[PDB]
Paper text:
The two recently opened beamlines for macromolecular crystallography at NSLS-II have launched the microcrystallography field into new territory, with flux densities up to two orders of magnitude brighter than those previously available. In this study, we highlight the capabilities of the AMX and FMX beamlines at NSLS-II by describing structure determination from single crystal vector data collection and two methods for multicrystal data collection. The advent of next generation synchrotron beamlines has necessitated the development of new strategies to fully benefit from the increased beam intensity and smaller beam sizes while minimizing radiation damage. The high dose rates, in conjunction with the newly developed ultrafast raster scanning goniometer brings formerly time-consuming serial crystallography measurements into the minutes range. These new opportunities mean that inhomogeneous large crystals can now deliver high quality data collected from their best volume, and crystals as small as 5 to 10 µm can deliver one or more complete datasets.
PHM is a dicopper enzyme involved in peptide amidation: it hydroxylates the C-terminal glycine Cα in the first step of a sequential two-step process to produce the amidated peptide product. Amidated peptides are frequently secreted and function as hormones, neurotransmitters, and growth factors. Our lab has previously published a series of wild type and mutant PHM structures that investigate the role of copper occupancy on catalysis and substrate binding. Crystals of H108A-peptidylglycine α-hydroxylating monooxygenase (PHM) were approximately 15 × 25 × 10 µm in size. Thirteen crystals were identified in the loop and multiple centers defined for collection of partial datasets with 0.2° oscillation and a total rotation of 20° to avoid overlapping of crystals. The datasets were processed individually using XDS and seven datasets were selected and scaled with XSCALE to give a final dataset to 2.7 Å resolution with 〈I/σ(I)〉 of 2.8, with overall Rmerge of 13.0%, Rpim of 6.2%, and CC1/2 of 99.1%, with values of 58.0%, 30.9%, and 83.0% in the highest resolution shell, respectively. The structures align well, with an RMSD of only 0.6 Å. In the case of H108A-PHM, a multicentering approach was used to collect the data and then the individual datasets were processed and scaled to give a complete dataset. This option works well for cases with a handful of small, easily distinguishable crystals that will survive 10 to 20° of data collection.
Author numbering: 47, 53 to 306, 310 to 354
Write the structure that this text describes.
């Protein structure tokens, strides 16, 4: 097939799979890079270096303690033992979002992610590549120069809805009250396991819904650009609906076991008042979903 300093303030780190040999199709490899600095640094850019022939997708996470110590591992074992803050999502034939000017992820120091964990997913494998080494990964741009806007993730996950067997349509709803400084959403990622039909994200302010993003979870799960970023402010509600099918299923499915309904909202905040991670696992305002826009029920 290390560390490259660019100027006084900046430097570049590339996180590459260490010459792995995926044997078969639909296989996920995970690896880790500890952060070279112990002071706070800002990830301000990404360069993907994926072999076009065999790599379906790549995920970059930041987390305090990862799932394995070895040069690489299967991500079926896990990504991080702790919160995996997703930093980067690349998919073949997918728009990779470019962070807006002056946006950087805060890493290192007291609060910031200690490690990067790289996930590479390989979907198309020839059996006449029984011993070919791949060094797939991404290049990260770090600066110690402080950024005015800090990127972070609002993770919306449906902790319990059950899909009754054979129900053609089942709705998974998540809502939380926003009680922080203003967050500006520039991207979103939706995740689900093959019963999902559509995932839609909304800001609700004074009973008026504003769309963040709608996607089919069966498509490439990259980060989709929010064409005009949504401002989410204190006293707003974030509401999300996942649509599922119970069709063809013998038993009830759970959303530990079975299904997932996850919405990833990528945002920026003024550095002064910024926090990197927020989560919602509640549906505080269930009654409100009657008034949900009709678009949210329209499939893709
Ligand atoms: Cu999942
Ligand atoms: Ni191990």
């Amino acid at each position: 097939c290390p560390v490259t300093p660019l100027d006084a303030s900046d430097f570049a780190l590339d996180i590459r799979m260490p010459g792995v040999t995926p044997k078969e199709s639909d296989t996920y490899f995970c690896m880790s890079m500890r952060l070279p600095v112990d002071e706070e640094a800002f990830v301000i850019d990404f360069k993907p270096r994926a072999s076009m022939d065999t790599v379906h997708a790549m995920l970059l996470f930041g987390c305090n303690m990862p799932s394995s110590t070895g040069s690489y591992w299967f991500c079926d074992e896990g990504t991080c033992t702790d919160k995996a803050n997703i930093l980067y999502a690349w998919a073949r034939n997918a728009p990779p979002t470019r962070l807006p000017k002056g946006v950087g992820f805060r890493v290192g120091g007291e609060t910031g992610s200690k490690y990067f964990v790289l996930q590479v997913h390989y979907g198309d494998i020839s059996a006449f590549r029984d011993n070919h080494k791949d060094c797939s990964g991404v290049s990260v741009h770090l600066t110690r120069v402080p950024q005015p806007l800090i990127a972070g993730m609002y993770l919306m996950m449906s902790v319990d809805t059950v899909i009754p067997p054979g129900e053609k349509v089942v709705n998974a709803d998540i809502s939380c009250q926003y009680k922080m400084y203003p967050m500006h959403v520039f991207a979103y990622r939706v995740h689900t396991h093959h019963l999902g039909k559509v995932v839609s994200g909304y800001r609700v302010r004074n009973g008026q819904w504003t769309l963040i993003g709608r996607q089919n979870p069966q498509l490439p799960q990259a980060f989709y650009p929010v064409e005009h970023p949504v401002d989410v402010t204190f006293g707003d509600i974030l509401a999300a609906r996942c649509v599922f099918t119970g069709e063809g299923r013998t038993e009830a499915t759970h959303i530990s076991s079975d299904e997932m309904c996850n919405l990833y909202i990528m945002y920026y905040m003024e550095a002064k008042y910024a926090l990197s991670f927020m989560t919602c696992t509640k549906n505080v305002a269930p009654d409100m979903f009657r008034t949900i826009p009709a678009e949210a029920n329209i499939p893709i």
